[PDB]
């Protein structure tokens, strides 16, 4: 395992979010990468990823 389930959140005031995993063991840096936000209907920045 060693791969925790990470959850990306929208920078928008909406509660929409994405989900995936990360190897915190070697990547203790919270991930962000921008994705589509259905609620706001616009590609924005997604954060939170241990």
């Amino acid at each position: 395992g060693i791969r925790e389930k990470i959850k990306l959140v929208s920078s928008a005031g909406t509660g929409h979010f994405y989900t995936t995993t990360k190897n915190k063991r070697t990547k203790p840096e919270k991930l962000e990468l921008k994705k589509f936000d259905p609620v706001v209907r616009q590609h924005v920045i997604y954060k939170e990823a241990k």
Binding site: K5, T19, T20, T21
Partner: protein
């Protein structure tokens, strides 16, 4: 005595315009992070009973 309906069953089915009952897809309410959004996107909508086991359904819901 009036036939009793299989409650547990009458909570997952719903007779349609005719014979069919249409239900809810499985594998769409647990461990989803590792599931193709597409796969699930094709699980949200309701689906009719396979006509194969449908016969059974029309037995658990006598008063359906």
């Amino acid at each position: 005595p009036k036939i009793k309906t299989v409650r547990g069953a009458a909570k997952r089915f719903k007779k349609t315009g005719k014979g069919g009952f249409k239900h809810k897809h499985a594998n769409l309410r647990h461990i989803l992070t590792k599931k193709a959004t597409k796969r699930k996107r094709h699980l949200r909508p309701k689906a009719m009973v396979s006509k194969g086991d449908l016969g059974l359904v029309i037995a658990c819901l006598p008063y359906a």
